[PDB]
């Protein structure tokens, strides 16, 4: 179906403890494939998925050069941002950037992204048009003016519609065993007495890829949104994800509750009940 490639970058200053630490990771869909950490003994971009390992030495050299240069511009940016916000040099601050592309089944660009946050807050984002900017505040407007003057957006658009989509197409082919395989959830319901009056029903989804999934409980056919505890989807560590949804059920009402599961690896959504 549809796919994404995204690069994430974080620099965190640490005054009095050397230069800001820079960490960048790349994903295709929910699969990590490259990483770079400036605190590594010998910082290089490193493979993290089998289908990227076949890239040759020129690829790794170029990628590493890009990551090193971005670490340095982030350090200049963190200095600039202290000026823009009138901040002292004493505290730790955070600069984050994400960029990348979403494509459809036919591989054409669906949406591109390039956006920054400072201290956990939206700072400036390339709009969906890939041609104009949304600045969160008057500091980010200073950046916007510089980026408009330098026609940054036009360069980003060229990458996002061109190289980004072409790399993603290559990776999807080289990784077709895994990137193009959905693993459906393994599902079951457990029952956990709380008191004489009620018990938890917990609906589990395990071993699924990609991470997107919908779990819901109904009672007599009515969604129980307010009364469902839904944990964040979480990594298992073997590429797959886990999730559960739980409801507190009065004694003897268990068969009125049904759990509903949607996942791209399922040809039809599932309905489950507690099976004593």
């Amino acid at each position: 179906g549809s796919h994404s490639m995204r690069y994430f970058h974080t620099s965190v200053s640490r005054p009095g403890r050397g230069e800001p630490r820079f960490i960048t990771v790349g994903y295709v869909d929910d699969t990590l494939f490259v990483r770079f950490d400036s605190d590594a003994a010998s910082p290089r971009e490193e493979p993290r998925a089998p289908w990227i390992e076949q890239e040759g030495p020129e690829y790794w050299d170029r990628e590493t050069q890009i990551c090193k240069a971005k670490a340095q511009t982030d350090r200049e940016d963190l200095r600039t941002l202290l000026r823009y916000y009138n901040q002292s040099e004493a505290g730790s601050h955070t600069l984050q950037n994400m960029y990348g592309c979403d494509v459809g089944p036919d591989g054409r660009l669906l949406r591109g992204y390039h956006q920054h946050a400072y201290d956990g807050k939206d700072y400036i984002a390339l709009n969906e048009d890939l041609s104009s900017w949304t600045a969160a505040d008057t500091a980010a407007q200073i950046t916007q003016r510089k980026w408009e003057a330098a026609r940054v957006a036009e360069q980003l658009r060229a990458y996002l519609e061109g190289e980004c989509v072409e790399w993603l197409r290559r990776y999807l082919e080289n990784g077709k065993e895994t990137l193009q395989r959905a693993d459906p959830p393994k599902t079951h319901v457990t029952h956990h007495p709380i008191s004489d009056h009620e018990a938890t029903l917990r609906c589990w989804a395990l071993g699924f890829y990609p991470a997107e999934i919908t779990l819901t409980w109904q009672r007599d056919g009515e969604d129980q949104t307010q009364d469902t505890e839904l944990v964040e989807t979480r990594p298992a560590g073997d590429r797959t994800f886990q999730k559960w949804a739980a409801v507190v059920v009065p004694s003897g009402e268990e068969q009125r509750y049904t759990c509903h599961v949607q996942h791209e690896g399922l040809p039809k959504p599932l309905t489950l009940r507690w099976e004593p």
Binding site: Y7, G26, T143, L156, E163, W167
Partner: peptide, 9 residues
């Protein structure tokens, strides 16, 4: 593969 376009705030 990454964007190679230096961009400073």
């Amino acid at each position: 593969g990454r964007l190679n376009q230096p961009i400073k705030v």
